[PDB]
Scaffold this motif. Structure first.
Motif, mmCIF file in Angstrom:
data_model
loop_
_atom_site.group_PDB
_atom_site.id
_atom_site.type_symbol
_atom_site.label_atom_id
_atom_site.label_comp_id
_atom_site.label_asym_id
_atom_site.label_seq_id
_atom_site.Cartn_x
_atom_site.Cartn_y
_atom_site.Cartn_z
ATOM 1 N N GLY A 154 0.879 -1.029 0.138
ATOM 2 C CA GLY A 154 -0.032 0.011 -0.068
ATOM 3 C C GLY A 154 0.978 1.132 0.035
ATOM 4 O O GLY A 154 1.940 1.362 0.425
ATOM 5 N N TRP A 155 0.369 2.336 -0.815
ATOM 6 C CA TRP A 155 0.980 3.412 -0.678
ATOM 7 C C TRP A 155 -0.059 4.585 -0.171
ATOM 8 O O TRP A 155 -1.191 4.716 -0.708
ATOM 9 C CB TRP A 155 1.206 4.225 -1.997
ATOM 10 N N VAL A 161 -11.224 -7.350 -0.456
ATOM 11 C CA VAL A 161 -10.123 -7.121 0.746
ATOM 12 C C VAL A 161 -9.544 -5.979 0.186
ATOM 13 O O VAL A 161 -9.139 -5.090 0.956
ATOM 14 C CB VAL A 161 -9.556 -8.544 0.806
ATOM 15 N N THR A 162 -8.968 -5.996 -1.152
ATOM 16 C CA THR A 162 -8.118 -5.001 -1.779
ATOM 17 C C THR A 162 -8.858 -3.692 -1.684
ATOM 18 O O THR A 162 -8.189 -2.630 -1.456
ATOM 19 C CB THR A 162 -7.723 -5.778 -3.179
ATOM 20 N N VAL A 163 -10.011 -3.686 -2.126
ATOM 21 C CA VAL A 163 -10.773 -2.457 -2.144
ATOM 22 C C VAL A 163 -11.151 -2.002 -0.844
ATOM 23 O O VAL A 163 -10.874 -0.809 -0.584
ATOM 24 C CB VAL A 163 -12.269 -2.710 -2.919
ATOM 25 N N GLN A 164 -11.359 -2.734 0.169
ATOM 26 C CA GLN A 164 -11.696 -2.340 1.302
ATOM 27 C C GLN A 164 -10.237 -1.756 2.200
ATOM 28 O O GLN A 164 -10.275 -0.631 2.832
ATOM 29 C CB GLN A 164 -12.085 -3.619 2.412
ATOM 30 N N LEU A 165 -9.125 -2.407 1.916
ATOM 31 C CA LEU A 165 -7.848 -1.885 2.393
ATOM 32 C C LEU A 165 -7.670 -0.500 1.781
ATOM 33 O O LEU A 165 -7.124 0.297 2.687
ATOM 34 C CB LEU A 165 -6.748 -2.881 2.194
ATOM 35 N N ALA A 166 -7.814 -0.475 0.456
ATOM 36 C CA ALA A 166 -7.402 0.876 0.020
ATOM 37 C C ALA A 166 -8.284 2.033 0.296
ATOM 38 O O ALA A 166 -7.880 3.109 0.709
ATOM 39 C CB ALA A 166 -7.448 0.706 -1.694
ATOM 40 N N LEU A 183 -3.393 3.527 -2.444
ATOM 41 C CA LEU A 183 -3.305 2.762 -3.545
ATOM 42 C C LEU A 183 -2.906 1.318 -3.024
ATOM 43 O O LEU A 183 -1.811 1.264 -2.152
ATOM 44 C CB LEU A 183 -2.140 3.163 -4.340
ATOM 45 N N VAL A 184 -3.527 0.146 -3.208
ATOM 46 C CA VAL A 184 -3.144 -1.053 -2.783
ATOM 47 C C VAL A 184 -3.027 -2.054 -3.935
ATOM 48 O O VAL A 184 -4.032 -2.096 -4.821
ATOM 49 C CB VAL A 184 -4.223 -1.378 -1.529
ATOM 50 N N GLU A 232 -5.550 -4.388 -8.272
ATOM 51 C CA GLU A 232 -5.263 -3.079 -7.355
ATOM 52 C C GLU A 232 -6.261 -2.177 -7.372
ATOM 53 O O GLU A 232 -7.212 -2.496 -8.176
ATOM 54 C CB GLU A 232 -3.890 -2.542 -7.941
ATOM 55 N N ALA A 233 -6.452 -1.352 -6.388
ATOM 56 C CA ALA A 233 -7.303 -0.543 -6.020
ATOM 57 C C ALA A 233 -6.601 0.866 -5.741
ATOM 58 O O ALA A 233 -5.976 0.814 -4.954
ATOM 59 C CB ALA A 233 -8.302 -1.011 -5.183
ATOM 60 N N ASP A 234 -7.075 2.088 -6.186
ATOM 61 C CA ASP A 234 -6.655 3.252 -5.960
ATOM 62 C C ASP A 234 -7.537 4.177 -5.414
ATOM 63 O O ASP A 234 -8.315 4.645 -6.178
ATOM 64 C CB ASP A 234 -5.977 3.933 -7.097
#
Lengths: 64, 62
Positions: free
Chosen positions: A12-13, A36-41, A47-48, A59-61
């Motif tokens: 993640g950034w 999980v990616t979208v939630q984390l991001a 950006l994850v 990835e999701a930004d």
């Protein structure tokens, strides 16, 4: 699967350029990994990228 | 600038704790390899180097 968990490495950034990273064991498949990616991001305004076996799979930004 | 690239390093300490570093380096692979090994050896860690989200080097000093 549950008997053979998938190890997903998330990188993640933050908007600041600061970074975070986590290894998460998931028993599901595509839909779970994406959610999980979208939630984390989204939670982190970040950006994850999700990696499995060192390859980027999603990835999701949400940095805006 | 055309000779430089941003490289993303991910590391694992033997405890399993992780770190991740974004480092500007020469684009020549020999330099990126050297930094991968140095980061791994100094931190007694497993370190993977990613360029354009492709893993290009890995070193393990756990």
């Amino acid at each position: 699967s549950m008997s053979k968990l998938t190890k997903v490495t998330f990188i993640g950034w933050f908007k600041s350029g600061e970074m975070f990273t986590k290894d998460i064991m998931l028993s599901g498949d595509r839909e779970e990994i994406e959610w999980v990616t979208v939630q984390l991001a989204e939670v982190n305004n970040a950006l994850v990228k999700a990696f499995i076996n060192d390859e980027k799979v999603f990835e999701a930004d949400f940095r805006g």
